[model samples]
Target chain A: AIPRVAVVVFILNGNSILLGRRRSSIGNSTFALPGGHLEFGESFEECAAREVMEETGLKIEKMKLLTVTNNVFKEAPTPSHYVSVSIRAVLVDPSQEPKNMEPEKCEGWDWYDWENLPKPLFWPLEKLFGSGFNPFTH
Target chain B: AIPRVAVVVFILNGNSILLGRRRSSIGNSTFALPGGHLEFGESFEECAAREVMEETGLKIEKMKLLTVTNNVFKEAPTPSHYVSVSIRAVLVDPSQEPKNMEPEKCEGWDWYDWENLPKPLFWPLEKLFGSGFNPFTHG
Candidate 1:
């Protein structure tokens, strides 16, 4: 499998971060962030905003580059590799709520405590947590 | 045209930066930094090191994420786009010289004064220089 660049953002609302379950073959049934592959000539910030809006129907702004993580999926149902560029962002209008706009790719959108995420985290995000990366600290 | 993530590094040696002439249709005959696309499961730093060694036969270390630039090539000879992640790096062993290892993709490697670079820089790099970015200023 070819290595692709993916942009993922953690929508931080106070002390909670938004997440969803993957519905695609890459990480099927696993919990993941709201993100997708980078488009041609698009900045990481642009990708983050576009992905979040497409998946959750929420507009995001104030994108900050957090860190880059190397994810090696050798034991997946379909072995693949991804270089995940993680970002931290917030919604433009917090009064508007997030909804599962794209049911084909993601399950549903919900907020989870950063300290207590759900089971079976995406490979890249799990690695980020294992490396002691905290978005709040950045 | 699929969007790919590329890691390009400006190897700073003293006051000058290294550049090469493109020999491919992507950016043919234009001056560009010495870097390539990222590989799976590799950090930006690793991609920089591997690309410099493969393209110019130089080993680099201490790669710092200088900035991220959005490069949209709507009208090019090939009409492609790339998300270029710019990096600032230093040579691991400054004594080693740089050579043009990939003559097929690049014409040759040379160092030019940052103040006065060669003409016809790559679109993204030209914009970068125009924005008043200095590598030495970071240190």
Candidate 2:
């Protein structure tokens, strides 16, 4: 009924970014960024920090605006639209690794080189890349 | 039950910006940037261009990222929340002046200097100013 706002965080490490294989009802098995829907009364920075910590169990520094993308999921279990907001941040502890807090939602998180991202990226991410946006430089 | 995304356009004319007064339940009579909710499948640039034209009848150049702020209105007529996305743009025709296309939505459009803004701004604009963000430089 509405275009949802999603705050996706890019936690960059060297030339790589933190990404995960989604396992939810939508976008199952496709790689995605650490993110979630923007909650009411929450700022983008808060949402990015909260989502990354919850999903990957790592704290992030202040998130800087990267870019925005619009996505409509048609060939999906639940068709929907999203105002995908991209934000770039760094892990507070660079040596820390990700732990899958919600196993049912994602396979696991890993730092993959942006150029070497897994095939079949999620729709939002695919649209993001289709726009010729490379978050690594943002 | 939810939050909303609003695409607000900042049409800068030198040191001044395009602004108008609201005339609805959301932020009645307060000065605001030309903007509206992000319709399904519409990008930020598309929405910014759409809203500015609908309300002010002025064509704008491509919008660039300014900033984003969240607001939950309690004093609003119908209390709500909005994820306001601020975008900076310039009029395609620098000589173009705004017309009150949607008088029901806005009293009229005017280019006000950022240094000397009117009192009692809309929440989104208020927050933008309160954040110490000068859209002129985005510094």
Candidate 3:
């Protein structure tokens, strides 16, 4: 039984995608894509969408799924782990103004371009935008 | 960052979903969903549908997202950590057969009901077909 992990969204508006800093969670002081693990029987989209709204208070639209990497062999806490699905979406209306709701889980929020992202990202999310990560990569 | 994980499906008949045994690239001899990890600039649905075809050689129509969970403190490997999203999608064509190609990362293939599945399944899949597991959870 590979422990299930869910990667939510790296939303883009113009050239930047939404990024956040952890407040009290494991990634507690680092910046990351807004997302969490899967509920017992929840869908990936719903979770990503919900997590984004809960953490940053913005609606998501026009999702563009990028990759699905198998993470069983990776250095994870659970030996029974397998795949990690990372998705990228577009924040429909970036000008709508984001609200800070879960300040404890998400302390800071901002938008950064893919080419130049804030330092200390939670994941090598930049990898997704690389040529090697061309989604079509086998 | 916390690593993320997810569940993928490639349905065959009305009773079972298509699955393949993992190869060296993916992992060990365990069964796996035709899906892979989500990319940075994509949606879960897009990732699920794309990975399914890449691994199993099958086309998915109308990918309906199922469930998502947040587990930031679960303690996963470095850079591979984060909450995981689990997506359950049925085969658009119940009669379509899977194409047998790509001998590297996948090998064995079959369809099994959500009720009587094989051993060593990816964890989140356990709750995929129970009473509480239903379409209502997604919306």
Candidate 4:
């Protein structure tokens, strides 16, 4: 089967990035970015904005493309391959905090140092960092 | 249903671009660029290289990201939606010309002025141009 394409947004705030722990499906229990499968007839920026709001209840004003990674989750119940498009976004209101809008999917949202990320990251993120994608250059 | 992702390449040579007249599939009977449906585990550049070679018998040495386009072919027999990734590439050997490697799929290959593309362009190309993508600004 052809690999599915998904969009993941990195909510950047200075030297820190927003992340949440996954609680269900695929890479459960791992620290994941706020994103989901890209919908038809939608741009990457549009997907990033929607996923961030739906999952974290945060508003993003600007989004930019960072890079793409090929994630092959061989350990999943059903092995899956995805070409995840990574995007970086800035919060519209710096004072606004993120909420666990989807407690069923994400554990909680928090900002962590980009130089030091949480352990046991999501499969897509593992591939992304392994591929040498540096969002800090943005 | 989810939309499919396709990779198309713009073979650049100064002010000109490589293109072929498609004779089959969704956007048939139109001037189409060299490309095909991206395969599983293959990168955009790889797909561009493979399709360019398979359809035109030209080897691409360098490729770079250009932009992406959302192509919705509602006029097709079974309307299809594709998020097409646009890439720009230059040939390994500029002297080498393209051959009609796949006559059934394409009418023939030729170089055309980018500023003056032939009429009846492919749906995806139409979207790319309308989106204001400029490959010439690249190094």
Candidate 5:
């Protein structure tokens, strides 16, 4: 069975988006999208909304699909990887500055210009940002 | 550490509380509360609201803290099992009905009188019920 999850990226402006660095529990030391595994019967849209609120305190409206990705790798042949749905949305209150509110799961957060995304954005994500992106790595 | 996961009972309208039978996935073919492991940084209240919606699809509200329980029989001999909360909240929507929405994850759904809760209530809940009483099982 495929491991499915949903991710929501809060894109404030055309050039920048919010990024969260994993801290303690789930993703110990990695920088990636703000999301989690899908629950038993939750729609991806609902998960994306709930996860965004949990990962970041911002409540967002109008979530738009950006991409769908399957994180398979060059080192593996089997396709048993996490299937993710990426979404872009605007914050309900962008004025309320982002903070490390969820201390248990994230350590740092910052806005990154799309042109200059962070140095090493969680492995397997580097290629995901390049032009003519093909998010189906698996 | 106390287990972040918990079991909550949603009792409704002076009737037996709702009980979900595990169908597929993790706890398949067993009787258990509609609950799950907590996410890394989510509060207990947030988890409660979310889990019920996922399992029962009932829009439950007015969650007051009814009880906090500790399950030890399922514990290891050395230092044993962790403590988990068993909150009892009334299913505010007494008129709203429960359905077998997720066929793969749930075997069936039923409402039983509090005293008539399924025998042994999926083992982990045995201590909480303690041979049981009327309407006490339903939040």
Candidate 6:
């Protein structure tokens, strides 16, 4: 198989970004954005919306491409690589709350300040911050 | 291994778009944009620039994200899949010519009018045209 193209969307609400505690084999027990591999025939925006809903039961709007980064895990127990495409989006309704729809893959969702993210972020998110990526900027 | 993310750039020159005759086993003998799979730790723009130059020996500038399409080839003679990120770019020098840097993967480069493309386009290009995608409208 080829390197996977993953779509990771940062759902921002004011000063906070939505993230979930990942429970998957790839990045177990790490906090990460809501996303998955790009499926067949869908645009990035389409994949963003679908993944967000599937994992968090929250709908996203104003979906747009933010930036992309290549994540290569060379020293991990399961060596893997991904070209992660990050998108910025907004909640369909500001009042709706995010629920964990798939406990097998992730824990419940929560919002965190951009300046203060949780410890032990997924590799891609950690690399994203290390590269000084700020989605709010033009 | 994970499925690779590939970036395909359509370098527009007025009403014409640059394309090449693909000579790879994946899309052999079909005309397609000059591109290749993304390398590790590089941004989409970086991959776009590198792939275009490596394949066509043409330097591009003003690289911008045009759009992205998920290409899952399930019915091909060989089963393969890729999430293709398409970017729109322009030649750094308007008068610069593109040379075939890798003849094993591509025949040669040429510009074709959008209205009249050459026969037997690669699957992705065919789908792009079938979807009525025009890069000039937004940018």
Number of the top candidate by TM-score? 2
Task: State the DockQ of every prediction.
Answer: 0.42, 0.58, 0.11, 0.45, 0.02, 0.30
CAPRI docking class of candidate 6 = acceptable
Give the per-residue lDDT digits (tens) of candidate 1, residues A50-118: 989888888989998877665777777878777678889988998778899999888898989987889
- Tens-place lDDT per residue, model 4, A1-138, is 787878899888989989899997698899989998888767788889999989988999778877665566666787776777778889899988999999999889999997899899987787667867668783
Quality of candidate 6 docking, DockQ = 0.30
Range of the 10 consecutive residues with the lowest summed lDDT in candidate 5 chain A: A72-81
Of the pair 3 and 6, which is ahead by TM-score? 6
Cα lDDT for residue A79, model 4?
A: 73
Q: For every candidate structure, what is the RMSD over all alpha carbons to the true structure, in angstroms?
A: 3.4, 2.9, 12.5, 3.1, 15.5, 5.0
Candidate 2 CAPRI assessment class: medium
User: What TM-score against the true fold does each predicted structure earn?
Assistant: 0.79, 0.83, 0.46, 0.81, 0.42, 0.67
How far in Å is the alpha carbon of A52 misplaced in model 5? 1.0
Tens digits of per-residue lDDT for model 3, A7-116: 55767677776678877424456777777665544456776788778877889876555555443324334333434556667667767656667776787778777577
Ranking by TM-score: 2, 4, 1, 6, 3, 5
The fnat of each candidate, in order, is 0.60, 0.74, 0.19, 0.43, 0.00, 0.38
lDDT of 5 by residue, A4-90 (tens): 343545445445777777764333465676776655444446667788777667677776655544454323344334435566677
| For model 3 chain B, the run of ten residues with the poorest summed lDDT | B73-82
**Candidate 4 local lDDT, B22-59, one digit each (tens):** 98768788898888888876778888899899989999
Docking class of 4: acceptable
Residues B6-95, candidate 3: write the lDDT tens digits. 435544356576766777422356666676666544556777787777766676776655544333333323223334455667666666
Error of 5 at B89 (Å): 51
Misplaced by over 4 Å in model 3 are: A70-83, A124-131, A134-138, B1-139
lDDT of 3 at A66: 56
Q: In candidate 6, which residue ranges exceed 4 Å CA deviation?
A: A1-3, A9-18, A21-32, A38-54, A57-81, A85-98, A101-107, A110-138
The sequence of per-residue lDDT tens digits that candidate 1 reaches over residues B51-114 is 9999999988888877656677778777776767778998888878889999999999998887
- As for TM-score, the candidate ahead, 2 or 6, is 2
What RMSD does model 5 have? 15.5
